[PDB]
């Protein structure tokens, strides 16, 4: 195939970059035509690239001045593979001026994607282009704000005034039709030099190789961006091209020269195979020097695990700094920190293990710490692992960083003698870091569900007055990995004891909860800042349990006339390990007032169902105290259940349409006198039986000699709850169905009914009992002659 591969590119501000497409046949990527401001129609009526045939990704046209008809630019563009769809679009047309007609009749098919054509004040032939024949995905088009011999698919499809939209036969779906309209090769598409010939194909349906069109890439020629075939060496070279240039470090995965190894797969030093590696083993990110100034300064640093450079962080400012960072384990260069104001500690570097420091900060300092105010802790060197390959240590102007911390990096990083004198400024660092930390030991602990009582050793500096007071640092410890540090650390002051241990207790605690506790002291440092403090190691306490909470959302449904299924939620407050559930249920009596209501009347409706300013005063008192001393002295039951490992339940063996009371409780204890929560109450009624209200039983009538009939029938003694009344329909030969109501009292005292003075003839008897579920069944006709 004669031409160059034409990587995707864009042209701006003039026609000068247009000349670079002269020797182009197939675009491998995407072209963008835009910013043609200093451009005229004449400068482009005399320019074309007939050699150009294929474009891989898309084309972009936006704000181009001068171009009048695009048939001139691209007389031989046939297929846009749509491999990369710009804004999920295979073609974008926006803000077009000087342009009148489309002119690209040579485009017949698009593999995938859609086209957006917007802001075309002077576009023509808007309704004369067949989109469905070209676009396999037509509903995503956005064609708005526009000026709006050959077959009609009925409007004729024409691109220009002279040549129209070529309509290959539908049999040539993707083969392409030749000049006379014959299906070309399957690898051919649109048009072909010779019909049915991969060697003479203008276009390659799936892949290209050696002037010929193939569907797949055979080895050693690997798939190349889903459009052509290449062996390993050239793909290596471009991969190695990225090695010694700015890039797309190429890799071959699935025998495809994709720029990127897929997830969990990693580069091999020998071959380009993206070998497996659990979660992408590493993530080195090149720079070699970049400062970190804010959150966004670490945007590309997300997921980086190794830095082939050095970092100079200066954050002139919470946990957001941890999520960005801490993914990194090794850094080839040095680390420099300076005046990061709001940096209390460097905890958020979780993964920091090794530092090459081969590139050395001036003074050969693999580390540089300066103007660090709030920096109180580097890392828990008792557990964290860190080592420096080489370099020196700079630690200056860090008034709130204890020297003991400094004493730990050389013993952790193996830099014991690498430094020299003044590498650490003994006086600029930890001036306000009081870390004498006289170990403090708790004397006694008493615990409860809410009130825990402490007691600790009473400690004394050489002057008892020096002690300002105690304060207890406490906060719930879900885990065991808790260190002091903008920080919550709930803490309460304690006045020094009068001179037994001081001790203290707390309130408002949550039973069955772990807490982390440590204690420090307050002493006014001497004239030489010899604070000589005392500190308690952090301790963890877990309070006991209590009565739990009610299980939540107790919901029960009558899935059957005998099945009652319950659902609920675990209690909001387990307050200890919940051993099981307490369930209590009971048949509920219905209302007895319905047993006296006579429903034959109106009422037929049926109810169904700061500090230092204090330190002045302390010093003030002793000073006055001391002065006089020098002056004065002269040296001459219910059905229940235990639901275990379940949040639902079913109760069966229940009568239909029966009211119930349901009681649910939670207990965090089973054998030894359970601590149980209070109950959750829901009322349950099953569905009624479908045969319980039907009047079952022979109907007996007694005609009296004076034309009186007495009604005797058997009601269904087990009704749906109960039967409100009996509806009776009696009809005589030639008459209509009269209606009769038999109340509960009417069937009680009359054992049926008493009908008197009936017209002579033969009647019918139909009685239906209405239970709470509703009407039952009408009785069978008891015809009687009067």
């Amino acid at each position: 195939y004669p031409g160059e591969v034409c990587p995707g590119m864009d042209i701006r501000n003039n026609l000068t970059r247009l000349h670079e497409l002269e020797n182009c046949s197939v675009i491998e990527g995407h072209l963008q035509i835009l910013l043609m401001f200093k451009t005229r129609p004449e400068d482009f009526r005399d320019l074309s690239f007939p050699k150009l045939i294929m474009i891989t990704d898309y084309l972009l046209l936006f704000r181009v001045y001068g171009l009048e008809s695009l048939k001139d630019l691209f007389p031989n563009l046939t297929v846009i593979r749509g491999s990369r769809l710009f804004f999920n679009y295979a073609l974008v047309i926006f803000e077009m001026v000087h342009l009148k007609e489309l002119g690209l009749y040579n485009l017949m098919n698009i593999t995938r994607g859609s086209v957006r054509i917007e802001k075309n004040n002077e576009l023509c032939y808007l309704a004369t282009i067949d989109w469905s024949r070209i676009l396999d995905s037509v509903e995503d088009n956005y064609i708005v704000l526009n000026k709006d011999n050959c077959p009609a698919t009925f409007v004729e499809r024409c691109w220009t005034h002279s040549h129209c939209q070529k309509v290959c036969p539908t049999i040539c779906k993707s083969h392409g039709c030749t000049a006379e309209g014959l299906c070309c090769h399957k690898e051919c598409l649109g048009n072909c030099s010779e019909p049915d010939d991969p060697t003479k194909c203008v276009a390659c349906r799936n892949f290209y190789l050696d002037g010929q069109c193939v569907e797949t890439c055979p080895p050693p020629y690997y798939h190349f961006q889903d459009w052509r075939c290449v062996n390993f060496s050239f793909c290596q070279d471009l991969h190695f091209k990225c090695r010694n240039s700015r890039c797309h470090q190429y890799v071959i995965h699935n025998n495809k020269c994709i720029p990127e190894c897929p997830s969990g797969y990693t580069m091999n030093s020998s071959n380009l195979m993206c070998t497996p590696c659990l979660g992408p083993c590493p993530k080195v990110c090149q720079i070699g020097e970049k400062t970190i100034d804010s959150v966004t300064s670490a945007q590309e640093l997300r997921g980086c695990t190794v830095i082939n450079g050095s970092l100079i962080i200066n954050i002139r400012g919470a946990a957001e700094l941890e999520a960005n960072l801490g993914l990194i384990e090794e850094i080839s260069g040095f680390l420099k920190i300076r005046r990061s104001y709001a940096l209390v500690s460097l905890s958020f570097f979780r993964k920091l293990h090794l530092i090459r420091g081969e590139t050395l900060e001036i003074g050969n300092y693999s580390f540089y710490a300066l103007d660090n105010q709030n920096l109180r802790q580097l890392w828990d060197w008792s557990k964290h692992n860190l080592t420096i390959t080489q370099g020196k240590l700079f630690f200056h102007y860090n008034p709130k960083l204890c020297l003991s911390e400094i004493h730990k990096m050389e013993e952790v990083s193996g830099t014991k003698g690498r430094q020299e004198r003044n590498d650490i400024a003994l006086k600029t660092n930890g001036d306000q870091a009081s870390c004498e930390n006289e170990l403090l030991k708790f004397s006694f602990i008493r615990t409860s569900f809410d009130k825990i009582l402490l007691r600790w050793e009473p400690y004394w500096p050489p002057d008892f007055r020096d002690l300002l007071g105690f304060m207890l640092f406490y906060k719930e410890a879900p885990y065991q990995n808790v260190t002091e540090f903008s920080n919550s650390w709930t803490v309460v002051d304690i006045d020094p004891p009068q001179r037994s241990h001081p001790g203290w207790l707390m309130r408002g605690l949550k039973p069955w909860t772990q807490y982390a506790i440590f204690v420090k002291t307050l002493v006014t440092f001497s004239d030489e800042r010899r604070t000589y403090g005392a500190k308690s190691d952090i301790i963890y306490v877990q309070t006991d349990a209590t009565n739990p909470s009610v299980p939540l959302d107790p919901i029960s449904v009558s899935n059957s006339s005998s099945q009652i299924i319950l659902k609920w939620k675990p209690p909001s407050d387990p307050n200890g390990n919940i051993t099981h559930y307490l369930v209590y249920w009971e048949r509920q009596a219905e209302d007895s007032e319905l047993f006296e209501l006579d429903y034959c009347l109106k009422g037929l409706k049926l109810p169904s169902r700061q500090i230092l300013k204090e330190l002045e005063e302390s010093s003030f008192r002793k000073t006055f105290e001391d002065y006089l001393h020098n002056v004065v002295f002269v040296p001459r039951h219910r059905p229940f259940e235990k639901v275990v490992n379940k949040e639902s339940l079913v109760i069966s063996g229940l009568r239909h349409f029966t009211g119930y009371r349901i009681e649910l409780q939670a207990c965090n204890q089973d054998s030894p006198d359970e601590r149980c929560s209070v109950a959750a109450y829901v009322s349950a009624r099953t569905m009624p039986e479908a045969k319980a209200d039907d009047i079952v039983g022979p109907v007996t009538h007694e005609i009296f000699e004076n034309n009186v009939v007495h009604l005797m029938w058997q009601e269904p003694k087990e009704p749906n709850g109960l039967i409100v009344l009996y509806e009776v329909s009696y009809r005589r030969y030639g008459d209509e169905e009269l209606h009769l109501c038999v109340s509960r009292k009417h069937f009680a005292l009359e054992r049926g009914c008493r009908l008197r003075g009936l017209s002579p003839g033969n009647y019918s008897v139909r009685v239906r009992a209405t239970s709470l579920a509703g009407n039952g069944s009408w009785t069978e006709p008891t015809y009687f002659y009067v």
């Binding site: 910013l35 401001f37 803000e95 802001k119």
Partner: peptide, 21 residues
């Protein structure tokens, strides 16, 4: 913005070029 801003930017440029990556 949008429709107008493009000419707003164009008038202050055109000969110096419009910067691109």
């Amino acid at each position: 913005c949008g429709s107008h801003l493009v000419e707003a930017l164009y008038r202050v440029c055109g000969e110096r070029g419009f910067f691109y990556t």
